[PDB]
Design a protein around this ligand. Sequence first.
Ligand SMILES: NC(=O)C1=CN([C@@H]2O[C@H](COP(=O)(O)OP(=O)(O)OC[C@H]3O[C@@H](n4cnc5c(N)ncnc54)[C@H](OP(=O)(O)O)[C@@H]3O)[C@@H](O)[C@H]2O)C=CC1
Ligand SMILES: NC(=O)C1=CN([C@@H]2O[C@H](COP(=O)(O)OP(=O)(O)OC[C@H]3O[C@@H](n4cnc5c(N)ncnc54)[C@H](OP(=O)(O)O)[C@@H]3O)[C@@H](O)[C@H]2O)C=CC1
Ligand SMILES: O=c1ccn([C@H]2C[C@H](O)[C@@H](COP(=O)(O)O)O2)c(=O)[nH]1
Ligand SMILES: O=c1ccn([C@H]2C[C@H](O)[C@@H](COP(=O)(O)O)O2)c(=O)[nH]1
Ligand SMILES: CCc1nc(N)nc(N)c1-c1ccc(Cl)cc1
Ligand SMILES: CCc1nc(N)nc(N)c1-c1ccc(Cl)cc1
Lengths: 216, 221, 326, 326
Amino acid sequence: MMEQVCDVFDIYAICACCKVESKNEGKKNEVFNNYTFRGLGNKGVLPWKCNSLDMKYFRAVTTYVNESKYEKLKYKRCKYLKLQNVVVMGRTNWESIPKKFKPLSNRINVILSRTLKKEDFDEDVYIINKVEDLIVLLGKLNYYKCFIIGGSVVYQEFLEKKLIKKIYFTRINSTYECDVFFPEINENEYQIISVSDVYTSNNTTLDFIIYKKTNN
Amino acid sequence: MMEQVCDVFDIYAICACCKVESKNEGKKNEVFNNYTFRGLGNKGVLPWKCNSLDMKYFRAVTTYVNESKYEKLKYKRCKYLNKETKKLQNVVVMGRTNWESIPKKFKPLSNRINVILSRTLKKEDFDEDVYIINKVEDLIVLLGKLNYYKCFIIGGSVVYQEFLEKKLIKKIYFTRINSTYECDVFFPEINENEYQIISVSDVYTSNNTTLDFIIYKKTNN
Amino acid sequence: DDEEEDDFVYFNFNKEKEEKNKNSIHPNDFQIYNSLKYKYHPEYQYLNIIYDIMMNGNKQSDRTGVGVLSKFGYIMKFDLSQYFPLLTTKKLFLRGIIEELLWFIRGETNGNTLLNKNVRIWEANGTREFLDNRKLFHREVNDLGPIYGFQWRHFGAEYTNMYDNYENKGVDQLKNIINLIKNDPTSRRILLCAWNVKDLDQMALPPCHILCQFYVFDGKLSCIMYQRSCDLGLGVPFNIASYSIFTHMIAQVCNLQPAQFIHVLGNAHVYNNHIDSLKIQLNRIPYPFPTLKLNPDIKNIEDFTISDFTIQNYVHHEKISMDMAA
Amino acid sequence: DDEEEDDFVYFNFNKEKEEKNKNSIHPNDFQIYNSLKYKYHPEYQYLNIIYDIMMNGNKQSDRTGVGVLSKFGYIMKFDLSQYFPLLTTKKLFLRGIIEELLWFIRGETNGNTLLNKNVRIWEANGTREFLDNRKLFHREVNDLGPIYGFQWRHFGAEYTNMYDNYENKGVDQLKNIINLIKNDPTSRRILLCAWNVKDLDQMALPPCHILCQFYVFDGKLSCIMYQRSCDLGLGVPFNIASYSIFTHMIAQVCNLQPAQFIHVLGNAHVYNNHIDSLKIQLNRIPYPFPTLKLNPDIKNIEDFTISDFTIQNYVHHEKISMDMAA
Ligand SMILES: NC(=O)C1=CN([C@@H]2O[C@H](COP(=O)(O)OP(=O)(O)OC[C@H]3O[C@@H](n4cnc5c(N)ncnc54)[C@H](OP(=O)(O)O)[C@@H]3O)[C@@H](O)[C@H]2O)C=CC1
Ligand SMILES: NC(=O)C1=CN([C@@H]2O[C@H](COP(=O)(O)OP(=O)(O)OC[C@H]3O[C@@H](n4cnc5c(N)ncnc54)[C@H](OP(=O)(O)O)[C@@H]3O)[C@@H](O)[C@H]2O)C=CC1
Ligand SMILES: O=c1ccn([C@H]2C[C@H](O)[C@@H](COP(=O)(O)O)O2)c(=O)[nH]1
Ligand SMILES: O=c1ccn([C@H]2C[C@H](O)[C@@H](COP(=O)(O)O)O2)c(=O)[nH]1
Ligand SMILES: CCc1nc(N)nc(N)c1-c1ccc(Cl)cc1
Ligand SMILES: CCc1nc(N)nc(N)c1-c1ccc(Cl)cc1
C-alpha cells in the first residue's frame, strides 16, 4: 500500500562534507561523532575546492541507470500518483556549477527557485517554485532516480518534510573554512547501512557512507 | 521456446558411486577419469554397506523444499499442460530392487512422496503409502497431478539408464566415494557432450573413506 | 537462475546450524554490526576477526587461570598508500609505540630507557619477580635480554648485559634488509627475524612478532609481519600501527612508496574479560582513517626522532577500556 | 531488496575494468575453470591462487633472466582430519619428500644420503659450482651446510661438516616442540624455526620454509607453516604434502589427532615457463583427495622409516611437465 512519497517516488540525497575549523582551537577535536562532517560549501564553492575521487563518485551515482529495473518503478508510480536520473539543486548551487559543466550531462536538471525564469532556459532543463511542485514534475517525467544534490537550504527542507529515502554521504576527512553546513541528521530517523573502503584523493582521505530511512 | 519435460517437471537424478574392482592388468600406472567412479551396487545392496555422510547428504537433498519458490513452479507446470486458473514434498522415484534394498524401518522414505517403477509388482503387492507405476510415461502423468517441489530419480542402474536415455534428467547429484569395493551393477557412463560438471564440493571423510559431491548439468544444444 | 541457488543449500548440508558460543555472545547485542549491508571499510578486517573469534573461538585456559577464545591463522591487509590504519572504533595513542620502535632501531635491550620516557610497555616483563620466574636469576632488573633490538642489530652475538658495547658484533639484519631492498629489490630473502632459537631462554620473553618479510614492486614496498601470539582486544590494535609505521620508515629511507602492510596472525585470541568492551566496539561505525606524515628529510633508518612522526586527521570514537574492571 | 544492490554498483565505482594480464593471458583459455559455479573442493585454494597470480600478478625477473608473475601474502587451509591434500589436477609422487623429511628429522645435512636413495631434490644445490658461487669454497660437494636438519636438532651450534657428531650441542627444537605439545599444549611458543640468521651464508641456500607453529585444542593439532618464497607451479604442490605429512607425524607421536595444516605464502610466484602448463591444469576438475596412513606403532618422531607411510586412493589427472621445453 503505496503513499509516503520518499519511498514512493524514489528521492535520494547525495552530499560531501568536510570537517569545520573553529577560530578558538582549530584541530584535534576532543569529541567526535557523525556531525563532525558537516562542512558543505564556502563562499559559493566547495570548502576543499575540488576532489577528483568524490567528483567521480558523484557523477557515477547520479548518472547510473538500470533500465531492466525501471518498470518495477513505472508500475507502482503510475499506480500511485534513454532513461536518465533527476538532479534537483538550488539556485546558489546551480550558479556555482561551472559553464562547460551545465547542465549536468545525462541528467534531468531541476531547480528550486522563486526568481528564475522558466522562459529563459531549455526544456530538457526544468525549474520549480516550491518543494511540493517537484513531486508534480516527477509524475510527468520518465526518470530512474531523483537525487537532491544540494545545497544546505535544499537539504534541510527536504529532510524536514521527510522526502529523503537514502543519503549518499561522502566524508572528506580534512578541515576547511566553511560558511554553509549540512543539517544534523537525526540518528533515529536515519541510520548508516553501508561504509565503503577508504581512499586518498587530493591529499586527504575520504570514504563514502550510505544513510538509510529507518522504515521504522 | 520448445519446453523439454525435464525442465517443466524438474526431474533430477542423485546417486553415489565408488571405484570398481579392477582386474589390475599389470599397470599401477592406472588412468583416471569421471568414469572411474561407476560402482552403484553389489548383490542387491551398496558396495560399501553404509556411509553416514552420503546418507545425510542424500536425505537433505531429497527432502529439501522451498515453499516460496513453489508457486512459480506451479504456474509453469500448469502453463505447460495448458492448465490454468499438507506440507510440500519432493518425489523420489526408484526401481523395485532399490525399494527392496531398504530396511523396513525406513520405508517408505520419510517426508517424501515415494514412487516405484515395476512390472512384476502392482499396488496390491504393497502395504506402504507409495505409488506404483509401470512405465516412465506414468511418472510424467503422475507429476502433472501432484503438488511437489522437485522430482529425484534415486536408482538403481536400470532406472538411471532409461531416464538418461529418454533425456529426462536436468542435473545429476553425484557422490564420489573414493574407495574400491566389489560391484555387480554400475552407473551408466555419462556422455560428456550431454552433461557437464558445474559444481564440486568440499572433500570429507566418513566410514574410513573420503568422498565429495559433484553436480552435472545438461548441456548447450 | 535459481536453478543453481538450491544447490547452495545442498553444499551446506553438513554445516553447524548455529554458531558455537553464539549462546554466550548473544546477537541483539551486535545489532548495528549485523545491520550493515556493506562493510568495506578496512577496519572491518579487524572487527570481523573479533566477531569470528567471539562466535567460533575455542575456549581455552592459560596456565594462569585466565580465559580466552582463540582461533589459528588469519591475515589482514592494509593499503598504506590510501590510509594509515589506526583503529577508529576506539581511541589509540602512539607516542609509546613509536618510542619502542626507535628503541628497537637503536638495538637497545635496556628497559630503563623506555621507563624514563614513561613508556611502560615492557615494565612488567623486567621486574625482579618476572625475571626470576623466567629463571633469569642473574639478570638485572629491566635488562630484558637479547630481545628485538639485539636481534635486529646483533643476531648471533653472545649477549652479556644491556650496557655492553656490541659494536660490529653479530649480524646487523636491519642494515642488511635495507641494503637488500636498495640493491636487490626482487630478492625473496629480505627478512628481519627476531626469533633467535639459541637466545630464547635468555629473553625476558620470546618475541611475539616473529619476523617481517619485504616485497618490492614498481618502486613500492610491502611488508608482511608474522605474529605468533595475538591479544586481539588490546595488543593487535597497537601491533597494526607499529608495523605500519615501520613499513613507512623503511620505505622512505629506501626511497620507495609504502604499499601494503600485511598482518599474519598465528594464535589469535580474545581474553574473556574483553568481550563486553569488544561487543560495544563492534557496534561502532568506523570513521575514515587518518594519515601518517614522516619528516621527509630523514633518509637513514637510525635518524628518526619522536618529533618526526605526525598523525593527521585522526577522527575516533571515545576510548574504551577493554577490561571494565578498574 | 534491489537498491541495497544498486549501492553495491556504486561502491565498485573505482575499478579498473580489466585484470592486468588479461590481454596477455586470454580467458577462452580457462573455459572449464570459469564455467563452474561452486568450486568448494580444497584443491581450488591452490588453483585460485594460480589464477589470481596469472591475472593480477606483478611482472618481475626473480633471478636474473628467468622472470615470473608474483604476488605477496596468501593463506591456504587444509583439514587433515578430512583428507590428505595431495593435488589431483596433476600427478605427484611422495617417496622423495618423505625421505627428505626423515633426513631432516635425523638432523642430516649430507646430500649423499638422499642421492644414494635416488632422491635428487638437493642435487643441484650441492655441486662444486653451486657451492663455489655461494662463496662456499671450503665446503665438500653435497655438504649442504647448516640447513633444516641441523637447525631442527642443533640450532645455535657451530657447524663444522656433514660428518660431525653434534651431540648435545645447540638447541634440539624438534624435541622441545614435541615436549611442549605434550606437557604445555596451550602454549603460544610452540615454533620450529629453520631460519637461523647467523647461519644463512653457510647454507647451500636459506630455507624457503621459515617456520612451523603448532596449535593444540581438544586433542587436535594444527600447524601453520610460513613460506618466504613459493614456486606455485612446481614447489608448492610438494610443500603442502611435505608439511601435511609432518603435521600427522607430530600429532601421532604426541597422541593427538591432526586437524588443520595452514600454509602461509609470502612471495608467491609463477614462472613464465609454467604458464601454459598451469592453464591446462586449471581446466581440470579435481578428484576427491586421497588419505594418508602412518604405521600406528611409531611413537617417537625419530623412529619413522619409509615403509611407515601409505597414501591411499590417490585418484589423479595425467602427470604434467610444468616446463614443456625439449
Ligand atoms: N558539499 C556539498 O555536497 C554541497 C555544497 N553546496 C555549497 O553550498 C553553497 C549554497 O548553499 P545554500 O545557501 O544552502 O543554497 P542553495 O544553493 O542550495 O539554494 C539557495 C536557493 O534555493 C532557493 N529556495 C529556498 N527555499 C526554496 C523553496 N521553498 N522553494 C523553491 N526554491 C527555494 C532560493 O531561490 P531564490 O532566492 O530565487 O528564491 C535560494 O536562493 C554553495 O557554496 C555550494 O557550492 C551545495 C550543495 C551541496
Ligand atoms: N549407490 C547408489 O547411489 C545407488 C546404488 N543402487 C544399488 O543397485 C541395486 C539396484 O540395481 P538394479 O537392479 O540395476 O536396478 P533398479 O533398482 O533400478 O530396478 C530396475 C528393475 O526395477 C523395475 N523397472 C525399471 N525400469 C522400469 C520401467 N521403465 N517400467 C517398469 N518397471 C521398471 C523393474 O522391476 P521388476 O523386475 O518388477 O519389473 C526392473 O526389473 C541395489 O544394490 C542398489 O542398492 C541403486 C541406485 C543408486
Ligand atoms: O605487541 C604485542 C605484545 C604482546 N601481545 C600479547 C600476545 C599474548 O597475549 C601475550 C604474550 O604471552 P605468550 O603468548 O608468549 O605466552 O602478549 C600482543 O598482542 N602484541
Ligand atoms: O621446497 C621448496 C624449495 C624451493 N622452492 C622455490 C622457491 C623459489 O622459486 C626458489 C628458491 O629461490 P629463492 O627464493 O631463494 O631466491 O625455489 C619451493 O617452492 N619449494
Ligand atoms: C563534486 C561535488 C559533490 N559531491 C558530492 N558527494 N555530493 C554533491 N551533492 C556534490 C555537488 C555539490 C555542489 C553542486 Cl553545485 C553539485 C554537486
Ligand atoms: C544413501 C544411498 C544413496 N546415496 C546417494 N548419493 N544417492 C542415492 N540415490 C542413494 C540411494 C541408493 C539406494 C536406495 Cl534404495 C536409496 C538411495
